[PDB]
Coordinates of C-alpha atoms in Angstrom, one line a residue:
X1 CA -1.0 -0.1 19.0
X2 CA -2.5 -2.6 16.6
X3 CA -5.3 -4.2 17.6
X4 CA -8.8 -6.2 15.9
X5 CA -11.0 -8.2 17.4
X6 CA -13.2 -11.0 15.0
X7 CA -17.1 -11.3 15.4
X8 CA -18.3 -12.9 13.1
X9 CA -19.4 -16.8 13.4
X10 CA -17.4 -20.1 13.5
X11 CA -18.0 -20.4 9.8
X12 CA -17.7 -16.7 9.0
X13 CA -13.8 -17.1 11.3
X14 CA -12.8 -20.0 8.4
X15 CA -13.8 -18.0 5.6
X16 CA -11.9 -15.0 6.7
X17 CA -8.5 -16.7 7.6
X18 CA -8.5 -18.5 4.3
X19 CA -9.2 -15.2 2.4
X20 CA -6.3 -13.8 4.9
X21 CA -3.8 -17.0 4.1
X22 CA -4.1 -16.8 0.7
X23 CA -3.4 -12.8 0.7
X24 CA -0.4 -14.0 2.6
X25 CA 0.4 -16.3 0.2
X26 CA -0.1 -13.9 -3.1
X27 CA 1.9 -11.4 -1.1
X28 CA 5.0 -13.9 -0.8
X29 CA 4.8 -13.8 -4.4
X30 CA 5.3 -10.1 -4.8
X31 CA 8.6 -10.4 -2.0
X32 CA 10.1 -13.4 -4.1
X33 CA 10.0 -12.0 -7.5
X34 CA 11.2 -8.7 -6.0
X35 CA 14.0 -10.6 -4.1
X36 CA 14.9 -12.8 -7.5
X37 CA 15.3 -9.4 -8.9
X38 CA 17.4 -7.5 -6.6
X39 CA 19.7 -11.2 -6.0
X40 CA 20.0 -11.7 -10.0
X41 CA 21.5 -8.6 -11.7
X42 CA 20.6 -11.0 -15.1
X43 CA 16.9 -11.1 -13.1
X44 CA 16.7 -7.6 -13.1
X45 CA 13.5 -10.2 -17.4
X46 CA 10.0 -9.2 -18.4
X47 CA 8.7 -11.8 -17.5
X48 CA 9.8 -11.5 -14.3
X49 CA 8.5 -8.5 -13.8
X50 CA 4.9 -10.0 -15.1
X51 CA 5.5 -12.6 -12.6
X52 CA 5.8 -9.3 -10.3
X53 CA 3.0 -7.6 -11.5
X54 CA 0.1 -10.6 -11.8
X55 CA 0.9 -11.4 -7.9
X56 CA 0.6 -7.7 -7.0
X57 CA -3.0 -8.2 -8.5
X58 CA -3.7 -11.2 -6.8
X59 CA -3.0 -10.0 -3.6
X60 CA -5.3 -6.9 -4.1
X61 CA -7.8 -9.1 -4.9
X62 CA -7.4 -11.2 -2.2
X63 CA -7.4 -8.2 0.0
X64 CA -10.7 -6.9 -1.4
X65 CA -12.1 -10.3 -0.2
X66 CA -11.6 -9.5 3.9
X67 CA -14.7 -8.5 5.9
X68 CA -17.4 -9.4 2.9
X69 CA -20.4 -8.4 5.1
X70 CA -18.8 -5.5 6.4
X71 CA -19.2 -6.5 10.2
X72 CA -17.3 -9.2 10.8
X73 CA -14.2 -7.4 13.4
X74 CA -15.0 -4.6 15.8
X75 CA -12.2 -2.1 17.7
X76 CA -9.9 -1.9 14.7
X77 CA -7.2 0.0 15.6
X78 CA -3.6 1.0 13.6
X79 CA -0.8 2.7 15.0
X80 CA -3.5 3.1 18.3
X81 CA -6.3 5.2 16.1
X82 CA -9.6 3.6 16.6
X83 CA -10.8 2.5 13.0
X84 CA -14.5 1.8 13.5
X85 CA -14.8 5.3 14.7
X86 CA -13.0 6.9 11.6
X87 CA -14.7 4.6 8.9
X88 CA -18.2 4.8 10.5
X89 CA -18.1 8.9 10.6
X90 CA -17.0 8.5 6.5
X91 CA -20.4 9.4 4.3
X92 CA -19.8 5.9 2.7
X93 CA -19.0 4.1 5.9
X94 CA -17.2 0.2 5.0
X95 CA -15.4 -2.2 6.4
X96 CA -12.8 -0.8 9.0
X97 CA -10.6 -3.9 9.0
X98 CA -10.6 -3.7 5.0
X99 CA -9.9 -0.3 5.6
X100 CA -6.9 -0.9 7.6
X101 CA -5.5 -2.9 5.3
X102 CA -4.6 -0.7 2.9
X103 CA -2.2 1.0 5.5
X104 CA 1.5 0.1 5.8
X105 CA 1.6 -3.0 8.3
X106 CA -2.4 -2.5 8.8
X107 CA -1.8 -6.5 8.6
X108 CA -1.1 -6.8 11.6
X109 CA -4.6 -5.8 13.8
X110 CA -6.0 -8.4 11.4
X111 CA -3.6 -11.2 11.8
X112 CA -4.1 -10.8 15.4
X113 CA -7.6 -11.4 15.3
X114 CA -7.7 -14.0 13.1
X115 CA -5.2 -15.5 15.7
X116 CA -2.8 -16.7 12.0
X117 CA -0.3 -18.8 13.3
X118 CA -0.2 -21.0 9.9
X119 CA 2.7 -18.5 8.6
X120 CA 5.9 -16.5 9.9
X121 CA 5.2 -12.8 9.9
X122 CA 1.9 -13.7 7.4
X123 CA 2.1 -9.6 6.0
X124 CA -0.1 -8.4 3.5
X125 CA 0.7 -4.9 1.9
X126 CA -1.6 -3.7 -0.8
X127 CA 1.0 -0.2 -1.3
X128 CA 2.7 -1.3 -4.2
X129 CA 3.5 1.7 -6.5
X130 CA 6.5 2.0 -9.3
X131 CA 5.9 -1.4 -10.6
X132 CA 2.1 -1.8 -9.6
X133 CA 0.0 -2.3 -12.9
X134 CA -2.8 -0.1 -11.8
X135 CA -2.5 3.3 -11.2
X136 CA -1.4 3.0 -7.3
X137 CA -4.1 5.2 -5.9
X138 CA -6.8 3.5 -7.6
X139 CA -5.5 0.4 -6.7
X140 CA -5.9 1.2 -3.0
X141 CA -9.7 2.1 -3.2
X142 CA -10.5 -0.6 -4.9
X143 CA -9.2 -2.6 -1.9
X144 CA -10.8 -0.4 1.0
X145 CA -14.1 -0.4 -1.1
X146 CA -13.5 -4.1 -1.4
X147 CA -14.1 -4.1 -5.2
X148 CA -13.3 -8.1 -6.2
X149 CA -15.5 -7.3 -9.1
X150 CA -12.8 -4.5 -10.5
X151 CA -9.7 -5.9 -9.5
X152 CA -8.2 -7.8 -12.3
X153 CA -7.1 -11.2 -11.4
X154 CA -4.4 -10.9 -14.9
X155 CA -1.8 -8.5 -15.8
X156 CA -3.5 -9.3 -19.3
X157 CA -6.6 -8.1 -18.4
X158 CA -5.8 -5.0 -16.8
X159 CA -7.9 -2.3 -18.3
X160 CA -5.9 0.6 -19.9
X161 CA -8.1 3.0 -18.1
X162 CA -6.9 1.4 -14.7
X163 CA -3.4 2.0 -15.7
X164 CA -2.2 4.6 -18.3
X165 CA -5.5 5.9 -19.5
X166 CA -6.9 5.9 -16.1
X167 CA -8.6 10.0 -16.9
X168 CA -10.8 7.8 -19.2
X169 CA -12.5 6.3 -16.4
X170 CA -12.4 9.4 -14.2
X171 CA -13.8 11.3 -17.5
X172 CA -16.7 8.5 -17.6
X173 CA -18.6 9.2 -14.6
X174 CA -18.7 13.4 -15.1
X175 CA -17.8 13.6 -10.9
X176 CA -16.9 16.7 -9.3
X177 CA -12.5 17.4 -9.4
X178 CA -11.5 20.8 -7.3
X179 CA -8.7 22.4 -8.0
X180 CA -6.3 21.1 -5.5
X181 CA -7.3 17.6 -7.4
X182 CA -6.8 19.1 -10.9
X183 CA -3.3 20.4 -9.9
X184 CA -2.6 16.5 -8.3
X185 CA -3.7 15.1 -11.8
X186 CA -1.7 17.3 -13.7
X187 CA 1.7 15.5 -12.5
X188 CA -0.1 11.8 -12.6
X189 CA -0.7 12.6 -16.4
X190 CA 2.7 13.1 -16.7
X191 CA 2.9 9.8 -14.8
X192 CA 0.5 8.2 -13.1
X193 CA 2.9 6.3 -11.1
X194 CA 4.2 9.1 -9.5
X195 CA 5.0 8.5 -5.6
X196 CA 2.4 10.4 -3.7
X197 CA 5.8 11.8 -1.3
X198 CA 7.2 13.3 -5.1
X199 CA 3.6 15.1 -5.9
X200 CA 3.4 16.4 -2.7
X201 CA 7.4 17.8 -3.1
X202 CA 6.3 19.0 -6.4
X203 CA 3.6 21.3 -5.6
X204 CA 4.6 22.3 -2.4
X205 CA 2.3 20.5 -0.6
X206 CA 1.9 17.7 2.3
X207 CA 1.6 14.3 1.5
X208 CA -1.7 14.1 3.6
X209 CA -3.1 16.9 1.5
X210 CA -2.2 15.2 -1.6
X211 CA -3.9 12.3 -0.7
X212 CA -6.6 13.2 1.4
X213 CA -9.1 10.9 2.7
X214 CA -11.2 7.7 1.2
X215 CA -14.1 8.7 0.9
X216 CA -16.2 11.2 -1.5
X217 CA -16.8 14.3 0.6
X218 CA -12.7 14.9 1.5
X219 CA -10.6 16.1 -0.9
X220 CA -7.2 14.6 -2.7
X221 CA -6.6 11.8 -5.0
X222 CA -8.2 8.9 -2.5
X223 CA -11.1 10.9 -2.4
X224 CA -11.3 11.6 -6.3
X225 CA -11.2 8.0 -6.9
X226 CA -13.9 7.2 -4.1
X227 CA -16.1 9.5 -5.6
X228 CA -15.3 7.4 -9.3
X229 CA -15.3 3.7 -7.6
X230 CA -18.5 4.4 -5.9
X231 CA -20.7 5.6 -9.1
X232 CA -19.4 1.7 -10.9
X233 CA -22.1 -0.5 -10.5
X234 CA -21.0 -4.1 -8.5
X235 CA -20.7 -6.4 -11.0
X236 CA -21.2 -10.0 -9.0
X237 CA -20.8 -12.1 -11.9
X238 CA -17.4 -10.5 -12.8
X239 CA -16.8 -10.8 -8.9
X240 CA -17.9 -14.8 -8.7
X241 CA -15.2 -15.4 -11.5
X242 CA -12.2 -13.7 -10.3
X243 CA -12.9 -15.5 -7.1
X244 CA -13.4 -18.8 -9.0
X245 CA -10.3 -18.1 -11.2
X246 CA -7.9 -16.7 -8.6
X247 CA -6.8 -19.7 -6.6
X248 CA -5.6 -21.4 -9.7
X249 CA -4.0 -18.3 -11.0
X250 CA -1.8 -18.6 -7.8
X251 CA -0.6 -21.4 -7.9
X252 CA 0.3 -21.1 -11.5
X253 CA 2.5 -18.5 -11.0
X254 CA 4.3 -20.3 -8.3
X255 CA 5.1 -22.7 -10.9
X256 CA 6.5 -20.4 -13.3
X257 CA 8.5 -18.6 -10.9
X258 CA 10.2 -22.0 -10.0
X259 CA 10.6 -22.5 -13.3
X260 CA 12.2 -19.4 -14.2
X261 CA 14.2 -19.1 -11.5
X262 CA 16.1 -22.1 -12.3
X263 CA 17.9 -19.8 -15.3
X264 CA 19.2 -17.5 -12.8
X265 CA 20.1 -20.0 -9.7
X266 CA 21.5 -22.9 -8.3
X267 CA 18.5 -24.0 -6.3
X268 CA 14.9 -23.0 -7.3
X269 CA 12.7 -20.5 -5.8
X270 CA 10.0 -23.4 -4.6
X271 CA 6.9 -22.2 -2.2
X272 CA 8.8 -24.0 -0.3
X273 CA 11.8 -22.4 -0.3
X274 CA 10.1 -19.3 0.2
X275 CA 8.4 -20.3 3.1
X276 CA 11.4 -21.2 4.5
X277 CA 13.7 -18.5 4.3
X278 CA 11.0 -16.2 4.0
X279 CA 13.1 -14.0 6.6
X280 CA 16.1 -13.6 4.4
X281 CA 13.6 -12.6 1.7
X282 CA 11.9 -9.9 3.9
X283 CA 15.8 -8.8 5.2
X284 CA 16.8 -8.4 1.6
X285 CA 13.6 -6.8 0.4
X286 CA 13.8 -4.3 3.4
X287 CA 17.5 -3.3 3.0
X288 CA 16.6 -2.3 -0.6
X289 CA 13.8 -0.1 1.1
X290 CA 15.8 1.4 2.9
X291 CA 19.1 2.5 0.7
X292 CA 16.1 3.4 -2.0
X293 CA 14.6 6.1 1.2
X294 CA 17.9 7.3 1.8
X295 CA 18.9 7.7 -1.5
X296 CA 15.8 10.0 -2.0
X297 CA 16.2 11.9 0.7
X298 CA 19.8 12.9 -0.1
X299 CA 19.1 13.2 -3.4
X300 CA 15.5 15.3 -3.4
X301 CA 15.6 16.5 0.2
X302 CA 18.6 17.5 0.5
X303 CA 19.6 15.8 3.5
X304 CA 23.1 14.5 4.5
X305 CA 23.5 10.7 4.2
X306 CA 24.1 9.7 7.5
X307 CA 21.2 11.3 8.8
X308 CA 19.2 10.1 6.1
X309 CA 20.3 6.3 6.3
X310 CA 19.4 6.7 10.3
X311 CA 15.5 8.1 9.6
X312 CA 15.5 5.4 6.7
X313 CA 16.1 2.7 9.2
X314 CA 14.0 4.3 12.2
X315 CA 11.0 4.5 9.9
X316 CA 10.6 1.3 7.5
X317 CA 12.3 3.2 4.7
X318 CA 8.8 5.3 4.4
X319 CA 9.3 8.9 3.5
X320 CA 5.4 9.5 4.0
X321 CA 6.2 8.4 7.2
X322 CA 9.1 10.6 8.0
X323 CA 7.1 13.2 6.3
X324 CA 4.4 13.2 9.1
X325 CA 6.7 12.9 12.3
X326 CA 7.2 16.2 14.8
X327 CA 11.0 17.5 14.3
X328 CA 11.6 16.8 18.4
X329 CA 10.2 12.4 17.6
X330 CA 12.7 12.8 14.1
X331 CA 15.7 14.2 16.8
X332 CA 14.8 12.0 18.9
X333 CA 15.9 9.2 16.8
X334 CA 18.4 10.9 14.5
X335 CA 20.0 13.3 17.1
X336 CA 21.9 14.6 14.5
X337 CA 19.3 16.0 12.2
X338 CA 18.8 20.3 11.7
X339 CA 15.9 22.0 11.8
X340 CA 16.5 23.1 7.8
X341 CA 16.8 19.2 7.1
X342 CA 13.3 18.2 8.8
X343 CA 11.1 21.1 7.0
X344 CA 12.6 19.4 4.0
X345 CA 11.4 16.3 4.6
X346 CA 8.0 17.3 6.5
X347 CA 6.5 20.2 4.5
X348 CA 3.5 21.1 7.6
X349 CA 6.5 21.8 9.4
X350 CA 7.7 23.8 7.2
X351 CA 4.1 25.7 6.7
X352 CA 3.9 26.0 10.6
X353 CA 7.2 28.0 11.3
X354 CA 7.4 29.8 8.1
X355 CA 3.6 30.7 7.1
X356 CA 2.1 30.8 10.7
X357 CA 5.3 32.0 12.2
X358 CA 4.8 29.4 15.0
X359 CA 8.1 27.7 17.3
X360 CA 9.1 24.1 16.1
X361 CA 7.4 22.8 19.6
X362 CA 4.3 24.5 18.9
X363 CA 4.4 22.7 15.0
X364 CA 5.1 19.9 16.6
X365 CA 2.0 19.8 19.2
X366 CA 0.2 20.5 16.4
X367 CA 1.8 17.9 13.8
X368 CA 0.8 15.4 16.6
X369 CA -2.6 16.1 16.9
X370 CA -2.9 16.1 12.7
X371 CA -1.0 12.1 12.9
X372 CA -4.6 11.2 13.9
X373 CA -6.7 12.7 11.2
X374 CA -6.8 11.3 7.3
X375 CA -6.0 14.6 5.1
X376 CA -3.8 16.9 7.1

């Protein structure tokens, strides 16, 4: 179901796994300042959440690194969708193994070809949202379009126009916004760090419309800011000095994470204590993911708890996941679960039955076929 297979040459293969290892590495960062956070009420410090935030960036840029050339894996495939076929069909084509990426656990098809073995369960998730310090969408085309010249490498030189004042740079290059867009803007002005699941609730729509496909030509707010990133010039020079600048900046905030998490316990966060018990850290950071899923799905889907601590667990704590899955695959799991409870959660299921008048199976054969396609 996850799949990649690498190229490129001998020299190309080294270049890649250290681009990948390092991405692992950055990404550790994000788990152990969120696990310092969630293990330390005290923890739950500014500059801890910096700490947070600059290995967030780090791992984005990292991540914009993978496939340079744009040819260096062949048959991606995620959750068993074949990836070369969807990116190469997209009007700005790109790297499909970037491209996966940027997909919860897309990791994996790249792990496997890169055959990584250096590191336990080496993840690297590029999905960070409440506390990521660019606006999250943007973040993630900056990754698929591999833009290591617009990443920032420093919480301190984020751009306001990448975070808060991110219409600026959507203002800047005069591209065309329909009204399904405008209507997604609306609620990122009022915050752009709005979960893509709560804009969808919001306006009534499915999460797939909201975010509709990477590239230009769909519609949503990937393809809003495809249509932006893809008018910025590449600046290589910009690009040569985040790369130059980046290793260092990683290792530096190793340090000050050991360093400031010897106010708050009894034996420091070291790399290598991470390493180590980098399986409690992933246990804790998933439980959290989990109680936080079920909590918003009681609380704004109106679902009882049990059945929404079992479709937590059953699905990674994702509620765009859930949010996708045919009612008879969600009863399947959570046996307990009404009919009421999953239009909630999925609203195409809800559009099926009440607005086409179809039966839940017939919503479901079509909520199948639609788990294949980016933007429905």
């Amino acid at each position: 179901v996850y799949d990649a297979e690498f190229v490129g040459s001998e020299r190309e293969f080294e270049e890649e796994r250290e681009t990948f290892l390092k991405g692992v590495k950055a990404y550790d960062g994000v788990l152990a300042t969120r696990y310092l956070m969630e293990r330390s009420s005290s923890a739950k410090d500014e500059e801890l959440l910096e700490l947070h935030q600059n290995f967030i960036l780090l791992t984005g840029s990292y991540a914009c690194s993978i496939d340079p050339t744009e040819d260096r894996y062949q048959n991606v495939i995620v959750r068993g969708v074949n990836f070369d076929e969807r990116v190469q069909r997209l009007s700005t084509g790109g790297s499909p193994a970037r491209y996966a990426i940027v997909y919860r656990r897309g990791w994996r098809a790249i792990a496997k070809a890169l055959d990584i073995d250096e590191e336990d369960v080496p993840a690297i998730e590029v999905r960070a949202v409440k506390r990521n310090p660019l606006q999250p969408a943007l973040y993630r085309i900056l990754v698929r379009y591999g833009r290591v010249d617009l990443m920032p490498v420093t919480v301190d030189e984020v751009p306001p126009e990448m975070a808060g004042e991110f219409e600026r740079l959507i203002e800047r290059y005069d591209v065309p916004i329909d009204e399904k867009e405008e209507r997604i803007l609306e609620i990122l002005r009022e915050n752009p760090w709005t979960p893509h699941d709560e804009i969808a609730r919001r306006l009534g729509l499915s999460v797939s419309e909201v975010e509709g496909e990477k590239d230009p030509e769909s519609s949503g707010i990937y393809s809003l800011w495809s249509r932006v990133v893809v008018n910025i010039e590449y600046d290589e020079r910009t690009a040569k000095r985040h790369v130059k600048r980046r290793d260092r900046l990683l290792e530096e905030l190793y340090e000050h994470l050991e360093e400031l998490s010897e106010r708050y316990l009894r034996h420091p966060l070291t790399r290598r204590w991470i390493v180590e018990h980098k399986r409690d850290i992933m246990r804790r950071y998933l439980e959290q993911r989990i109680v936080e899923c079920a909590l918003k799905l009681q609380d704004r889907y109106g679902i009882r708890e049990d059945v929404a601590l079992c479709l937590a667990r059953a699905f990674d704590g994702s509620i765009s996941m859930i949010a996708t899955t045919p009612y008879r695959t969600l009863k399947d799991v959570c046996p307990d679960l009404t009919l009421e409870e999953a239009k909630s959660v999925n609203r195409t299921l809800a559009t099926l039955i009440d607005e086409h008048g179809l039966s839940p199976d017939a919503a479901d054969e079509l909520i199948e076929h639609f788990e294949s396609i980016a933007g429905i």
